[PDB]
Design an enzyme around this catalytic site. Structure first.
Site, PDB file in Angstrom:
ATOM      1  N   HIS A   1     -11.177   2.666   4.168  1.00  0.00           N
ATOM      2  CA  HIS A   1     -10.473   1.439   3.950  1.00  0.00           C
ATOM      3  C   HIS A   1     -10.910   0.634   3.098  1.00  0.00           C
ATOM      4  CE1 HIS A   1      -7.415  -1.500   4.385  1.00  0.00           C
ATOM      5  NE2 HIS A   1      -6.667  -0.530   4.639  1.00  0.00           N
TER       6      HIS A   1
ATOM      7  N   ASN B   1       0.897  -1.208   0.112  1.00  0.00           N
ATOM      8  CA  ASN B   1       0.016   0.067   0.205  1.00  0.00           C
ATOM      9  C   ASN B   1       1.112   1.215  -0.118  1.00  0.00           C
ATOM     10  OD1 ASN B   1      -1.726   2.328   0.805  1.00  0.00           O
ATOM     11  ND2 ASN B   1      -3.274   0.879   1.859  1.00  0.00           N
TER      12      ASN B   1
END
Ligand SMILES: [Ca+2]
EC number: 3.4.19.12
Lengths: 76, 356
Positions: B256, B10
């Site tokens: 998220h 990420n």
């Protein structure tokens, strides 16, 4: 001409537009009917997300074309 | 772990990207087509299809978390745009459209439409005047209305039921001026791979803020959709199987993303949260992501499915067909190994555009 926009509810509204209208104009014309700011609204037409700066004709939007209005669930 | 599968690094806010990548990577028939895209003459700092073959190759071969660094670079993005949060479905529509365009002209031309595209009809009938119009649209996903609907089935009914173009939204009958009418939408075809976007949001103008809908919404493991077709096929029922659950956690501003998947089409599921991949139960992937779940250690209130992926029973052995190295061109393989060797020697836009 008269096109269809499918709101968040699913209800179908109508918009009066010329094919020379920019997407910003269309978004602004959704703002007057629905109250949604042009920033927060995404328009989808047959799988292509509409792009500010292009015009309805560029995407081959005609009478009775249905635009799908969606928002953004941002994420990480 | 005994997942065998590997996650993605990420870069900051790129979970929406990671979650999508897995979903597409395990759309096997699609992954093969990406492998056979002519890229020998392409420029890696600018080629989106190349960076995708790259991420797909390492997700298939590497036993360590795959970086998505070069993928954002091929978007024409700088480092900051890798710190912007985006809607996962918005990525889906931009990326797949970009890629379908690049596959045009190649040997895998139009692979994306074959998998994801279907058609529907929009019938308008004036209430007082005999006047009947018909129009047809293509779709690569369906926006399912959520508020007030128990489950997927009810959400389809509202989609296909008959609306009322009344008063302030009369239909332009050209000759007959404005007219009260009735619009109704029937599905013609359903694609081999069905993308569902759960409208989990609304906007109130009186208060001027947009809200996330965390209400309960039920989606089955098997999704018989034959009822919503205009003409059915007996040799091919519109029966679908759940493949992926794209999950957004958080409400309003934050977020998220995660994706749950049973890649091989079996019952074994796995949770892909960025670099971490873990095995998991069906309930953890399905029931837990129904939403409206009261904030417990097993499931949080503001965590729920936002996109669903269904594959037609009929065309499912085809879509989830196995991906060997037999289906990977040798010319690709070399280029990535040489990239490894040379590496060893040594307003911000909030609208998600791809520039290449
Ligand atoms: Ca439950």
């Amino acid at each position: 001409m008269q096109i269809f926009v499918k709101t968040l509810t699913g209800k179908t509204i109508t918009l009066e537009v010329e094919p020379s209208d920019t997407i910003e104009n269309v978004k602004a014309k959704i703002q007057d009917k629905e109250g949604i700011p042009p920033d927060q609204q995404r328009l989808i037409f047959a799988g292509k997300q509409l792009e500010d700066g292009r015009t309805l004709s560029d995407y081959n939007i005609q009478k009775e074309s249905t635009l799908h209005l969606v928002l953004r669930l941002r994420g990480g | 772990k005994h997942t065998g599968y590997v996650g993605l690094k990420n870069q900051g806010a790129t979970c929406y990207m990671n979650s999508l990548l897995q979903t597409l990577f395990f759309t096997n028939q699609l992954r093969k087509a990406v492998y056979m895209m002519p890229t020998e003459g392409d420029d890696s700092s600018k080629s989106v299809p190349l960076a995708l073959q790259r991420v797909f190759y390492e997700l298939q071969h590497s036993d360590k978390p795959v970086g998505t660094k070069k993928l954002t670079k091929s978007f024409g993005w700088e480092t900051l745009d890798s710190f912007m949060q985006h809607d996962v479905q918005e990525l889906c529509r931009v990326l797949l459209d970009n890629v379908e365009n690049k596959m045009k002209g190649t040997c895998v031309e139009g692979t994306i439409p074959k998998l994801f595209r279907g058609k529907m009809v929009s019938y308008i009938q004036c209430k007082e005047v005999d006047y009947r119009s018909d129009r047809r649209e293509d779709y690569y996903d369906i926006q399912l209305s959520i508020k007030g609907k128990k489950n997927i089935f009810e959400s389809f009914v509202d989609y296909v039921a008959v609306e009322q173009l009344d008063g302030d939204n009369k239909y332009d009958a050209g000759e007959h001026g404005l007219q009260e009418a009735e619009k109704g939408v029937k599905f013609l075809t359903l694609p081999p791979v069905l993308h569902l976007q759960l409208m989990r949001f609304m906007y109130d103008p009186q208060t001027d803020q947009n809200i996330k809908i965390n209400d309960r919404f039920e989606f089955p493991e098997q999704l018989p959709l034959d009822e919503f077709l205009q003409k059915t096929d007996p040799k091919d029922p519109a029966n679908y199987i759940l493949h992926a659950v794209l999950v957004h956690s958080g409400d309003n501003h934050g977020g998220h993303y995660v994706v749950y998947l049973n890649p091989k089409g079996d019952g074994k599921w796995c949770k892909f949260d960025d670099d971490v991949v873990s095995r998991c139960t069906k309930e953890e992937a399905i029931e837990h992501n129904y939403g409206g779940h009261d904030d417990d250690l097993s499931v949080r209130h503001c965590t729920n499915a936002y996109m669903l992926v269904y594959i037609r029973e009929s065309k499912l052995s085809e879509v989830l067909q196995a991906v060997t190295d037999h289906d990977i061109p040798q010319q690709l393989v070399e280029r990535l190994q040489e990239e490894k060797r040379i590496e060893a020697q040594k307003y911000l836009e909030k609208a998600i555009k791809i520039h290449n």
